[PDB]
């Protein structure tokens, strides 16, 4: 039975550096061309690095993405694949995988590479002014917009927990930037607009930070 | 080089074709992975093989498009597929293309388009918020315009995540400076679900 097991990975600050290594059973795996290929989270695969077997003499070959600052080696005594990830990007932040072979047949668990500074930041909370537009007559749409924070999660109520009809808060978007954003809208009563009043209270545990945002009509 | 389309859905039991473009991909080697939410991929194994009895797993790989087909398709085989091949520098993928297996009527999304607030604007900022709720299968494209150029930078999309009716929902942001926001007649968010779009259009005036 073909294993490949997957180490190293954890958070890291961007310009820092990294070791991953691959644990691989149940193959000779002295007779293997070995891979490491990436996932970004919610993206595709992007191959990063491949060493081929002890008789071609294990050169190394790599990406254009990660050329000179990753190294890829292996311990064919320890039967372990490794890979040095130096001067690490944002943009490398994704799940590393160990996959067998120029046929790629076999692949681990992976395992995940942050590349972030690890840095609490509380939300800004903007209100998004009731629109009828896109919803059912006599109702009309409203919202909160919580945006750049870290780390999950936040927590969106409506009036203080009192109105919960209607109420669709998001999964939240992880950005570019390493931060966070949600956000959460509520169906109401377009007769109700500016006789109610509402108000999003939104909790980031992690910064301490609590907002009551009140949302009014344009 | 290599081209997926975004998504494909099938009737439980009948075939379903997922290709993938590239030019001269027929004098490649095409790979297959079939990766289900949360797991790693594995290495979709698949006959080139003419004829015999028919296969659940097949490839054709001829000029420019290699497809995978999929035969007797059941909710099991939902995932996202992604190709490969060899290329001069390493491997080349895909960008991947979601089964979906129907298990209930297609749903048409329910779009939602927010300018940027006021309040967002007077801290130097602007976004837009287009939420995607109640559609199936869980796989839509979001595109955006600026007036009708298409616009790609500042875009973040989430990945379709399965409501409490079994339905999907998706939400995607346009970051913009309040300069940028202003000096458009319009930005609109544009969603495709299944061949057809809605597009929703605001304007800073």
């Known amino acids: 039975q073909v294993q490949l097991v997957e180490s190293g990975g954890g958070l890291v600050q961007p310009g820092g550096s990294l070791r991953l290594s691959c644990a691989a059973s149940?193959?000779?795996?002295?007779?293997?061309?070995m891979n490491w290929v990436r996932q970004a989270p919610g993206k595709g695969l992007e191959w990063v690095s491949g060493?081929?077997?002890?008789?071609?003499?294990?050169?190394?070959y790599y990406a254009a993405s990660v050329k000179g600052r990753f190294t890829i080696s292996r311990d064919n005594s320890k039967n372990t694949l490794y890979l040095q990830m130096n001067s690490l990007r944002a943009e490398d932040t994704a799940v590393y995988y160990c996959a067998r072979g120029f046929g790629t047949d076999f692949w681990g668990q992976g395992t995940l590479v942050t590349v972030s500074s690890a840095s609490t930041k509380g939300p800004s909370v903007f209100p998004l002014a009731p629109s009828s537009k896109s919803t059912s007559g006599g109702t009309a749409a409203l919202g909160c917009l919580v945006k750049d924070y870290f780390p999950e999660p936040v927590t969106v109520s409506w009036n203080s927990g009192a109105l919960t009809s209607g109420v669709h808060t998001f999964p939240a978007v992880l950005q570019s930037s390493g931060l966070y954003s949600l956000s959460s809208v509520v169906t109401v009563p377009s007769s109700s607009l500016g006789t109610q009043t509402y108000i999003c209270n939104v909790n980031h545990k992690p910064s301490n930070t609590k907002v009551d945002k009140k949302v009014e009509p344009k | 080089e290599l081209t997926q389309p975004p998504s494909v859905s099938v009737a439980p039991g009948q075939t379903a074709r997922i290709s993938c473009s590239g030019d001269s991909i027929g004098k490649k080697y095409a790979y297959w992975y079939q990766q289900k939410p949360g797991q790693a991929p594995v290495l979709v194994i698949y006959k080139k093989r003419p004829s015999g009895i028919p296969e659940r797993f097949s490839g054709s790989n001829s000029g420019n498009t290699a497809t995978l087909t999929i035969s007797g398709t059941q909710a099991e085989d939902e995932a996202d597929y992604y190709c490969?091949?060899?290329?001069?520098?390493?491997?080349?993928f895909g960008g991947g293309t979601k089964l979906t297996v129907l298990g209930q009527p297609k749903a048409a999304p329910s779009v939602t388009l927010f300018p940027p607030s006021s309040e967002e604007l007077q801290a130097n900022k602007a976004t837009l918020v287009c939420l995607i709720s109640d559609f199936y299968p869980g796989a839509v494209t979001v595109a955006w315009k600026a007036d009708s150029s298409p616009v790609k930078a500042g875009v973040e999309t989430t990945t379709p995540s399965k409501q409490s009716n079994n339905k999907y929902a998706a939400s995607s942001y346009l970051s913009l400076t309040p300069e940028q926001w202003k000096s458009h007649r319009s930005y609109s968010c544009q969603v495709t679900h299944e061949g057809s779009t809605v597009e929703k259009t605001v304007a800073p005036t």
């Open positions: 490969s091949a060899w290329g001069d520098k390493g491997m080349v």
């Open positions: 149940g193959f000779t795996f002295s007779s293997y061309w």
């Open positions: 060493i081929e077997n002890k008789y071609a003499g294990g050169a190394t």
